[PDB]
Protein backbone atom coordinates (compact mmCIF):
# COMPACT_ATOMS: atom_id res chain seq x y z
CA UNK A 1 0.00 0.00 0.00
CA UNK A 2 3.05 2.31 -0.05
CA UNK A 3 4.80 2.05 -3.41
CA UNK A 4 7.91 4.07 -4.29
CA UNK A 5 9.41 4.09 -7.80
CA UNK A 6 12.98 5.38 -7.88
CA UNK A 7 14.38 6.48 -11.26
CA UNK A 8 18.17 6.50 -11.22
CA UNK A 9 21.31 5.85 -13.25
CA UNK A 10 22.77 4.08 -10.22
CA UNK A 11 20.28 1.25 -9.49
CA UNK A 12 22.93 -0.77 -7.55
CA UNK A 13 22.90 1.84 -4.77
CA UNK A 14 19.42 0.68 -3.81
CA UNK A 15 18.05 -0.49 -1.53
CA UNK A 16 21.25 0.41 0.37
CA UNK A 17 20.33 2.19 3.64
CA UNK A 18 16.64 1.51 2.90
CA UNK A 19 17.43 -2.21 3.13
CA UNK A 20 18.42 -2.41 6.82
CA UNK A 21 16.71 -2.61 10.16
CA UNK A 22 12.97 -1.75 10.26
CA UNK A 23 12.81 -0.37 6.76
CA UNK A 24 14.43 -3.50 5.34
CA UNK A 25 12.29 -5.99 7.21
CA UNK A 26 9.16 -3.97 6.36
CA UNK A 27 10.30 -4.16 2.73
CA UNK A 28 10.65 -7.98 2.97
CA UNK A 29 7.23 -8.16 4.71
CA UNK A 30 5.73 -6.08 1.88
CA UNK A 31 4.52 -3.16 4.04
CA UNK A 32 6.06 -0.97 1.33
CA UNK A 33 7.38 -1.69 -2.13
CA UNK A 34 10.45 -0.29 -3.88
CA UNK A 35 10.74 -0.35 -7.65
CA UNK A 36 14.09 0.88 -8.89
CA UNK A 37 14.08 1.78 -12.54
CA UNK A 38 17.42 2.09 -14.30
CA UNK A 39 17.30 5.20 -16.44
CA UNK A 40 20.15 3.95 -18.67
CA UNK A 41 18.10 0.95 -19.85
CA UNK A 42 15.70 3.40 -21.51
CA UNK A 43 18.38 5.00 -23.71
CA UNK A 44 17.35 4.23 -27.32
CA UNK A 45 20.59 5.44 -28.90
CA UNK A 46 23.50 3.24 -30.07
CA UNK A 47 25.61 5.22 -27.62
CA UNK A 48 23.57 4.06 -24.53
CA UNK A 49 23.83 7.80 -23.51
CA UNK A 50 21.61 9.41 -20.90
CA UNK A 51 23.30 12.83 -20.66
CA UNK A 52 24.59 15.41 -23.06
CA UNK A 53 26.11 18.91 -23.06
CA UNK A 54 23.74 21.80 -22.49
CA UNK A 55 22.41 23.99 -25.25
CA UNK A 56 23.82 27.51 -24.84
CA UNK A 57 27.19 26.54 -23.46
CA UNK A 58 28.41 26.12 -19.94
CA UNK A 59 30.10 23.19 -18.26
CA UNK A 60 28.88 19.76 -17.26
CA UNK A 61 26.22 17.49 -18.66
CA UNK A 62 22.46 17.22 -18.44
CA UNK A 63 20.07 14.26 -18.44
CA UNK A 64 18.19 14.08 -21.77
CA UNK A 65 14.44 14.46 -22.14
CA UNK A 66 14.00 11.56 -24.58
CA UNK A 67 15.61 9.00 -22.27
CA UNK A 68 13.84 10.36 -19.20
CA UNK A 69 10.53 10.43 -21.09
CA UNK A 70 10.76 6.76 -22.08
CA UNK A 71 11.49 5.77 -18.50
CA UNK A 72 8.78 7.94 -16.98
CA UNK A 73 6.24 6.84 -19.63
CA UNK A 74 6.97 3.21 -18.69
CA UNK A 75 6.36 4.13 -15.03
CA UNK A 76 3.08 5.83 -16.00
CA UNK A 77 1.94 2.77 -18.03
CA UNK A 78 2.40 0.74 -14.86
CA UNK A 79 1.22 3.30 -12.29
CA UNK A 80 -0.93 5.89 -14.03
CA UNK A 81 -1.81 7.79 -10.84
CA UNK A 82 1.69 7.89 -9.39
CA UNK A 83 2.74 11.17 -7.82
CA UNK A 84 5.70 12.37 -9.89
CA UNK A 85 8.47 13.99 -7.86
CA UNK A 86 11.92 15.32 -8.77
CA UNK A 87 14.79 15.73 -6.34
CA UNK A 88 16.13 19.25 -6.92
CA UNK A 89 17.86 21.98 -4.85
CA UNK A 90 15.35 24.28 -6.53
CA UNK A 91 12.38 22.53 -4.97
CA UNK A 92 10.25 23.03 -1.90
CA UNK A 93 11.99 22.19 1.36
CA UNK A 94 11.24 18.69 2.55
CA UNK A 95 9.81 18.53 6.12
CA UNK A 96 7.91 16.03 8.21
CA UNK A 97 4.78 17.75 6.91
CA UNK A 98 5.60 17.47 3.22
CA UNK A 99 6.41 13.84 4.08
CA UNK A 100 2.87 13.31 5.43
CA UNK A 101 1.24 15.02 2.45
CA UNK A 102 3.37 12.84 0.18
CA UNK A 103 1.95 9.75 1.88
CA UNK A 104 -1.65 10.66 1.00
CA UNK A 105 -0.66 9.33 -2.40
CA UNK A 106 0.04 5.62 -2.17
CA UNK A 107 2.22 5.45 -5.27
CA UNK A 108 5.12 7.90 -5.42
CA UNK A 109 7.79 8.26 -8.09
CA UNK A 110 11.18 9.90 -7.28
CA UNK A 111 13.37 11.01 -10.17
CA UNK A 112 17.02 11.25 -9.18
CA UNK A 113 19.03 13.98 -10.89
CA UNK A 114 22.70 13.69 -11.76
CA UNK A 115 25.21 15.94 -13.49
CA UNK A 116 23.78 19.46 -13.80
CA UNK A 117 20.20 18.24 -13.67
CA UNK A 118 17.61 17.38 -16.25
CA UNK A 119 16.15 19.02 -19.36
CA UNK A 120 13.51 21.52 -18.18
CA UNK A 121 10.93 20.20 -20.66
CA UNK A 122 10.68 17.05 -18.56
CA UNK A 123 9.80 19.11 -15.48
CA UNK A 124 7.10 21.08 -17.35
CA UNK A 125 5.65 18.29 -19.43
CA UNK A 126 5.12 15.92 -16.47
CA UNK A 127 4.49 18.68 -13.92
CA UNK A 128 7.14 17.20 -11.66
CA UNK A 129 6.96 18.37 -8.06
CA UNK A 130 10.44 19.60 -7.22
CA UNK A 131 11.74 18.76 -3.70
CA UNK A 132 14.93 19.81 -1.91
CA UNK A 133 16.05 18.03 1.25
CA UNK A 134 17.96 21.16 2.32
CA UNK A 135 20.07 24.15 1.25
CA UNK A 136 23.11 22.21 0.24
CA UNK A 137 24.29 20.70 -3.07
CA UNK A 138 24.50 16.93 -3.42
CA UNK A 139 26.15 15.10 -6.36
CA UNK A 140 22.87 13.35 -7.15
CA UNK A 141 19.26 12.87 -6.18
CA UNK A 142 19.73 9.34 -4.88
CA UNK A 143 20.51 10.40 -1.29
CA UNK A 144 17.60 12.81 -1.38
CA UNK A 145 15.27 10.08 -2.53
CA UNK A 146 16.50 7.75 0.23
CA UNK A 147 15.93 10.53 2.78
CA UNK A 148 12.40 11.10 1.51
CA UNK A 149 11.58 7.40 1.46
CA UNK A 150 12.97 6.76 4.93
CA UNK A 151 11.06 9.68 6.38
CA UNK A 152 7.78 8.51 4.79
CA UNK A 153 8.10 4.76 5.40
CA UNK A 154 8.96 5.38 9.05
CA UNK A 155 5.30 6.49 9.41
CA UNK A 156 3.76 3.47 7.67
CA UNK A 157 1.83 1.57 10.37
CA UNK A 158 3.76 -1.55 11.33
CA UNK A 159 7.23 -0.32 10.33
CA UNK A 160 8.32 0.86 13.71
CA UNK A 161 6.90 0.14 17.15
CA UNK A 162 3.56 1.75 17.88
CA UNK A 163 4.69 3.40 21.16
CA UNK A 164 7.83 4.96 19.55
CA UNK A 165 5.74 6.20 16.64
CA UNK A 166 3.09 7.81 18.88
CA UNK A 167 5.78 9.43 21.03
CA UNK A 168 7.50 10.82 17.92
CA UNK A 169 4.18 12.33 16.68
CA UNK A 170 3.40 13.89 20.07
CA UNK A 171 6.91 15.49 20.32
CA UNK A 172 6.58 17.20 16.92
CA UNK A 173 7.16 20.94 17.28
CA UNK A 174 9.56 20.24 20.19
CA UNK A 175 13.18 19.26 20.52
CA UNK A 176 14.04 15.91 22.10
CA UNK A 177 14.82 16.01 25.83
CA UNK A 178 18.09 14.58 27.18
CA UNK A 179 17.97 10.79 27.38
CA UNK A 180 20.03 8.32 29.40
CA UNK A 181 20.56 4.57 29.75
CA UNK A 182 23.02 2.26 31.52
CA UNK A 183 25.60 2.50 32.95
CA UNK A 184 24.57 4.58 35.99
CA UNK A 185 27.97 6.28 36.00
CA UNK A 186 30.31 6.93 33.11
CA UNK A 187 33.50 8.97 33.11
CA UNK A 188 32.28 10.30 36.48
CA UNK A 189 29.02 11.61 35.01
CA UNK A 190 25.73 10.41 36.50
CA UNK A 191 22.17 10.34 35.30
CA UNK A 192 19.83 13.03 36.65
CA UNK A 193 18.35 11.57 39.83
CA UNK A 194 14.69 12.19 38.97
CA UNK A 195 14.96 9.61 36.18
CA UNK A 196 15.95 6.95 38.71
CA UNK A 197 13.07 7.51 41.15
CA UNK A 198 10.33 5.74 39.20
CA UNK A 199 8.28 8.86 39.68
CA UNK A 200 6.39 9.07 36.41
CA UNK A 201 4.82 12.43 37.25
CA UNK A 202 8.14 14.10 38.07
CA UNK A 203 10.00 12.40 35.20
CA UNK A 204 7.43 13.63 32.69
CA UNK A 205 7.56 17.15 34.23
CA UNK A 206 11.34 17.16 33.98
CA UNK A 207 11.26 15.99 30.34
CA UNK A 208 8.67 18.54 29.29
CA UNK A 209 10.62 21.39 30.87
CA UNK A 210 13.95 20.18 29.38
CA UNK A 211 12.41 19.96 25.91
CA UNK A 212 10.79 23.38 26.37
CA UNK A 213 14.04 24.97 27.47
CA UNK A 214 16.13 23.38 24.68
CA UNK A 215 13.55 24.27 22.00
CA UNK A 216 13.42 27.95 23.08
CA UNK A 217 17.23 28.13 23.17
CA UNK A 218 17.83 26.59 19.71
CA UNK A 219 14.67 26.46 17.65
CA UNK A 220 12.55 29.37 18.89
CA UNK A 221 10.99 29.38 15.40
CA UNK A 222 9.17 26.14 16.43
CA UNK A 223 7.29 28.69 18.65
CA UNK B 1 43.80 15.89 3.28
CA UNK B 2 40.05 15.41 3.85
CA UNK B 3 39.47 12.62 6.34
CA UNK B 4 35.99 11.54 7.50
CA UNK B 5 35.46 9.01 10.30
CA UNK B 6 31.96 7.56 10.33
CA UNK B 7 30.80 5.82 13.53
CA UNK B 8 27.90 3.48 12.84
CA UNK B 9 26.28 0.18 13.76
CA UNK B 10 25.75 -0.46 10.05
CA UNK B 11 29.28 -0.36 8.56
CA UNK B 12 28.19 -2.41 5.48
CA UNK B 13 26.09 0.54 4.26
CA UNK B 14 29.29 2.42 3.50
CA UNK B 15 30.67 3.59 1.22
CA UNK B 16 27.34 3.01 -0.59
CA UNK B 17 26.35 6.21 -2.46
CA UNK B 18 29.71 7.75 -1.48
CA UNK B 19 31.39 5.02 -3.52
CA UNK B 20 30.12 5.96 -7.00
CA UNK B 21 30.96 8.43 -9.71
CA UNK B 22 33.24 11.36 -8.74
CA UNK B 23 33.12 10.73 -5.03
CA UNK B 24 34.09 7.09 -5.52
CA UNK B 25 36.95 7.71 -7.91
CA UNK B 26 38.21 10.56 -5.69
CA UNK B 27 38.11 8.06 -2.81
CA UNK B 28 40.18 5.54 -4.84
CA UNK B 29 42.59 8.37 -5.83
CA UNK B 30 42.93 9.32 -2.15
CA UNK B 31 41.63 12.91 -2.48
CA UNK B 32 39.57 12.09 0.61
CA UNK B 33 39.63 9.23 3.07
CA UNK B 34 36.73 7.39 4.69
CA UNK B 35 37.21 5.44 7.90
CA UNK B 36 34.10 3.56 8.95
CA UNK B 37 34.20 2.46 12.55
CA UNK B 38 31.77 -0.24 13.64
CA UNK B 39 30.29 0.82 16.95
CA UNK B 40 29.30 -2.78 17.82
CA UNK B 41 32.95 -3.93 17.84
CA UNK B 42 33.53 -1.64 20.82
CA UNK B 43 30.88 -3.31 23.00
CA UNK B 44 32.77 -4.81 25.98
CA UNK B 45 29.83 -6.80 27.34
CA UNK B 46 29.21 -10.54 26.84
CA UNK B 47 25.93 -9.49 25.24
CA UNK B 48 27.66 -7.53 22.38
CA UNK B 49 24.95 -4.86 23.16
CA UNK B 50 25.16 -1.27 22.01
CA UNK B 51 21.70 -0.06 23.06
CA UNK B 52 19.52 -0.33 26.11
CA UNK B 53 16.18 0.92 27.44
CA UNK B 54 16.07 4.49 28.69
CA UNK B 55 16.20 5.45 32.34
CA UNK B 56 12.85 6.97 33.33
CA UNK B 57 10.66 4.88 31.10
CA UNK B 58 9.37 5.46 27.63
CA UNK B 59 9.62 3.32 24.52
CA UNK B 60 12.52 2.38 22.30
CA UNK B 61 16.21 1.97 22.95
CA UNK B 62 19.20 4.26 23.29
CA UNK B 63 22.87 3.88 22.35
CA UNK B 64 24.99 3.42 25.51
CA UNK B 65 27.67 5.85 26.65
CA UNK B 66 30.25 3.17 27.53
CA UNK B 67 30.22 1.61 24.07
CA UNK B 68 30.18 4.98 22.33
CA UNK B 69 32.98 6.22 24.59
CA UNK B 70 35.27 3.32 23.73
CA UNK B 71 34.71 3.88 20.02
CA UNK B 72 35.14 7.63 20.17
CA UNK B 73 38.23 7.32 22.42
CA UNK B 74 39.78 5.00 19.82
CA UNK B 75 39.03 7.63 17.15
CA UNK B 76 40.63 10.32 19.36
CA UNK B 77 43.77 8.18 19.93
CA UNK B 78 44.13 8.06 16.15
CA UNK B 79 42.97 11.58 15.29
CA UNK B 80 43.29 13.77 18.37
CA UNK B 81 42.20 16.98 16.61
CA UNK B 82 39.23 15.51 14.78
CA UNK B 83 36.10 17.65 14.73
CA UNK B 84 33.47 15.60 16.56
CA UNK B 85 29.99 15.82 15.05
CA UNK B 86 26.69 14.08 15.84
CA UNK B 87 23.83 13.66 13.41
CA UNK B 88 20.72 14.78 15.29
CA UNK B 89 17.32 16.36 14.44
CA UNK B 90 18.09 18.62 17.38
CA UNK B 91 21.16 20.09 15.75
CA UNK B 92 21.93 23.14 13.68
CA UNK B 93 20.56 23.01 10.15
CA UNK B 94 23.12 21.82 7.64
CA UNK B 95 23.67 24.25 4.70
CA UNK B 96 26.32 24.82 2.07
CA UNK B 97 27.85 27.27 4.54
CA UNK B 98 28.05 24.89 7.49
CA UNK B 99 29.55 22.48 4.93
CA UNK B 100 32.34 24.98 4.13
CA UNK B 101 33.03 25.72 7.80
CA UNK B 102 33.17 21.97 8.40
CA UNK B 103 35.89 21.69 5.76
CA UNK B 104 38.20 24.11 7.58
CA UNK B 105 38.88 21.10 9.76
CA UNK B 106 40.64 18.42 7.74
CA UNK B 107 39.63 15.53 9.98
CA UNK B 108 35.92 15.19 10.72
CA UNK B 109 34.13 12.53 12.74
CA UNK B 110 30.39 11.81 12.19
CA UNK B 111 28.54 9.81 14.84
CA UNK B 112 25.44 8.14 13.44
CA UNK B 113 22.51 7.81 15.83
CA UNK B 114 20.05 4.94 15.80
CA UNK B 115 17.04 3.99 17.90
CA UNK B 116 15.98 6.97 20.04
CA UNK B 117 19.44 8.50 19.99
CA UNK B 118 22.40 8.39 22.31
CA UNK B 119 23.02 8.92 26.03
CA UNK B 120 23.26 12.69 26.60
CA UNK B 121 26.48 12.34 28.61
CA UNK B 122 28.28 11.47 25.39
CA UNK B 123 27.11 14.73 23.80
CA UNK B 124 28.26 16.82 26.80
CA UNK B 125 31.48 15.00 27.59
CA UNK B 126 32.84 15.19 24.02
CA UNK B 127 31.14 18.50 23.17
CA UNK B 128 29.66 16.94 20.06
CA UNK B 129 28.43 19.44 17.49
CA UNK B 130 24.87 18.42 16.71
CA UNK B 131 23.79 18.69 13.03
CA UNK B 132 20.39 18.17 11.38
CA UNK B 133 20.10 17.79 7.63
CA UNK B 134 16.50 19.06 7.79
CA UNK B 135 13.22 19.14 9.72
CA UNK B 136 12.30 15.55 9.17
CA UNK B 137 12.93 12.35 11.16
CA UNK B 138 15.19 9.68 9.70
CA UNK B 139 15.60 6.14 11.14
CA UNK B 140 19.33 6.72 11.61
CA UNK B 141 22.20 9.12 11.18
CA UNK B 142 23.82 7.20 8.34
CA UNK B 143 21.94 9.02 5.56
CA UNK B 144 22.65 12.32 7.26
CA UNK B 145 26.34 11.54 7.42
CA UNK B 146 26.37 10.56 3.72
CA UNK B 147 24.61 13.84 2.88
CA UNK B 148 27.17 15.82 4.87
CA UNK B 149 30.11 13.98 3.36
CA UNK B 150 28.85 14.29 -0.20
CA UNK B 151 28.21 18.00 0.21
CA UNK B 152 31.72 18.58 1.63
CA UNK B 153 33.73 16.30 -0.67
CA UNK B 154 32.04 17.82 -3.72
CA UNK B 155 34.06 20.98 -2.88
CA UNK B 156 37.43 19.24 -2.47
CA UNK B 157 39.61 20.48 -5.36
CA UNK B 158 39.93 17.75 -7.96
CA UNK B 159 36.69 15.89 -7.14
CA UNK B 160 34.54 17.51 -9.74
CA UNK B 161 35.46 19.51 -12.82
CA UNK B 162 36.86 22.95 -12.13
CA UNK B 163 34.40 24.78 -14.43
CA UNK B 164 31.31 23.08 -12.86
CA UNK B 165 32.64 23.83 -9.40
CA UNK B 166 33.25 27.53 -10.14
CA UNK B 167 29.81 27.86 -11.74
CA UNK B 168 28.18 26.23 -8.70
CA UNK B 169 29.98 28.70 -6.34
CA UNK B 170 29.00 31.72 -8.45
CA UNK B 171 25.29 30.65 -8.56
CA UNK B 172 25.06 30.38 -4.75
CA UNK B 173 22.21 32.54 -3.45
CA UNK B 174 20.32 31.92 -6.73
CA UNK B 175 18.13 29.19 -8.10
CA UNK B 176 19.29 27.26 -11.16
CA UNK B 177 17.98 28.55 -14.51
CA UNK B 178 16.15 26.21 -16.91
CA UNK B 179 18.59 23.98 -18.80
CA UNK B 180 18.21 22.06 -22.05
CA UNK B 181 20.10 19.52 -24.17
CA UNK B 182 19.36 17.33 -27.20
CA UNK B 183 17.00 16.52 -28.80
CA UNK B 184 15.95 19.88 -30.31
CA UNK B 185 12.29 18.83 -30.13
CA UNK B 186 10.62 16.45 -27.73
CA UNK B 187 6.92 15.74 -27.36
CA UNK B 188 6.42 18.88 -29.47
CA UNK B 189 8.33 21.08 -27.01
CA UNK B 190 11.33 23.06 -28.29
CA UNK B 191 14.29 24.70 -26.65
CA UNK B 192 14.14 28.47 -26.18
CA UNK B 193 15.62 29.94 -29.36
CA UNK B 194 18.17 32.23 -27.69
CA UNK B 195 20.06 29.16 -26.48
CA UNK B 196 20.53 28.01 -30.08
CA UNK B 197 21.94 31.29 -31.44
CA UNK B 198 25.47 30.99 -30.07
CA UNK B 199 25.00 34.47 -28.70
CA UNK B 200 26.87 34.28 -25.42
CA UNK B 201 25.81 37.77 -24.35
CA UNK B 202 22.10 37.12 -24.87
CA UNK B 203 22.26 33.57 -23.47
CA UNK B 204 23.88 34.81 -20.28
CA UNK B 205 21.31 37.65 -20.03
CA UNK B 206 18.47 35.18 -20.47
CA UNK B 207 19.90 32.82 -17.82
CA UNK B 208 20.47 35.58 -15.28
CA UNK B 209 16.92 36.87 -15.70
CA UNK B 210 15.41 33.34 -15.54
CA UNK B 211 17.33 32.59 -12.34
CA UNK B 212 16.34 35.97 -10.90
CA UNK B 213 12.67 35.44 -11.70
CA UNK B 214 12.58 31.85 -10.36
CA UNK B 215 14.45 32.80 -7.17
CA UNK B 216 12.06 35.70 -6.40
CA UNK B 217 9.03 33.46 -7.07
CA UNK B 218 10.14 30.53 -4.85
CA UNK B 219 12.99 31.49 -2.57
CA UNK B 220 12.56 35.22 -1.94
CA UNK B 221 14.35 34.61 1.38
CA UNK B 222 17.58 34.17 -0.68
CA UNK B 223 17.03 37.98 -1.12
N1 LIG C 1 19.59 19.57 -1.77
C1 LIG C 1 19.11 18.71 -2.67
N2 LIG C 1 17.88 18.14 -2.60
C2 LIG C 1 17.42 17.28 -3.54
N3 LIG C 1 18.15 16.94 -4.61
C3 LIG C 1 19.39 17.46 -4.77
C4 LIG C 1 19.97 18.38 -3.80
N4 LIG C 1 21.21 18.73 -4.18
C5 LIG C 1 21.42 18.05 -5.33
N5 LIG C 1 20.34 17.31 -5.67
C6 LIG C 1 20.20 16.38 -6.80
O1 LIG C 1 21.49 16.19 -7.37
C7 LIG C 1 21.41 16.47 -8.77
C8 LIG C 1 22.73 17.00 -9.33
S1 LIG C 1 23.26 18.51 -8.57
C9 LIG C 1 22.73 19.73 -9.73
C10 LIG C 1 23.73 20.90 -9.68
C11 LIG C 1 23.19 22.14 -10.43
N6 LIG C 1 24.33 23.07 -10.75
C12 LIG C 1 22.13 22.85 -9.63
O2 LIG C 1 22.42 23.84 -8.94
O3 LIG C 1 20.95 22.47 -9.64
C13 LIG C 1 20.20 17.38 -8.92
O4 LIG C 1 19.65 17.37 -10.23
C14 LIG C 1 19.25 16.85 -7.86
O5 LIG C 1 18.48 15.71 -8.27
N1 LIG D 1 16.98 15.17 10.34
C1 LIG D 1 18.04 14.52 10.82
N2 LIG D 1 19.32 14.96 10.71
C2 LIG D 1 20.37 14.27 11.21
N3 LIG D 1 20.21 13.11 11.86
C3 LIG D 1 18.98 12.59 12.02
C4 LIG D 1 17.79 13.25 11.50
N4 LIG D 1 16.69 12.52 11.77
C5 LIG D 1 17.17 11.44 12.42
N5 LIG D 1 18.51 11.49 12.58
C6 LIG D 1 19.39 10.47 13.16
O1 LIG D 1 18.64 9.28 13.34
C7 LIG D 1 18.77 8.86 14.70
C8 LIG D 1 17.53 8.12 15.21
S1 LIG D 1 16.05 9.09 15.14
C9 LIG D 1 15.89 9.66 16.80
C10 LIG D 1 14.40 9.79 17.12
C11 LIG D 1 14.16 10.58 18.44
N6 LIG D 1 12.77 10.30 18.93
C12 LIG D 1 14.38 12.06 18.25
O2 LIG D 1 13.42 12.81 18.05
O3 LIG D 1 15.52 12.54 18.29
C13 LIG D 1 19.14 10.13 15.46
O4 LIG D 1 19.80 9.87 16.69
C14 LIG D 1 20.01 10.88 14.46
O5 LIG D 1 21.38 10.45 14.43
CL1 LIG E 1 24.40 1.16 -10.37
CL1 LIG F 1 -1.05 4.35 -9.75
CL1 LIG G 1 26.36 -3.40 8.56
CL1 LIG H 1 43.59 14.83 13.95
From Swiss-Prot, chains A, B:
HAMAP family, A to Z: TrmD (MF_00605)
Gene3D superfamilies on file: 3.40.1280.10, tRNA(m1g37)methyltransferase, domain 2
Description of how the protein assembles with itself and partners: Homodimer.
Name of this protein: tRNA (guanine-N(1)-)-methyltransferase
UniProt-annotated binding residues for S-adenosyl-L-methionine: 113, 133-138
Function summary: Specifically methylates guanosine-37 in various tRNAs.
Domain of life: Bacteria
One BP annotation, GO: tRNA N1-guanine methylation
Entry's localization field: Cytoplasm
Organism lineage: Bacteria, Pseudomonadati, Pseudomonadota, Alphaproteobacteria, Rickettsiales
Recorded family membership: Belongs to the RNA methyltransferase TrmD family.
Main location: cytoplasm
PANTHER family according to UniProt: TRNA (GUANINE-N(1)-)-METHYLTRANSFERASE
Catalytic activity: guanosine(37) in tRNA + S-adenosyl-L-methionine = N(1)-methylguanosine(37) in tRNA + S-adenosyl-L-homocysteine + H(+)
Known EC number: 2.1.1.228
One Pfam family of this chain: tRNA_m1G_MT
GO molecular function: tRNA (guanine(37)-N1)-methyltransferase activity
Amino acid sequence: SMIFNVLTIFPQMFPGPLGVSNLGSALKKGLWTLNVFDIRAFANNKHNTVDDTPYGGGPGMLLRADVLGRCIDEVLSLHPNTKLMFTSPRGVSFTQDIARQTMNFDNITLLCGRFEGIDERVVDFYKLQEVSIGDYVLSGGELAAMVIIDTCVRMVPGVIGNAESLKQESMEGSLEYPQYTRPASWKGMEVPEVLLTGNHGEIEKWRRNASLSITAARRPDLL
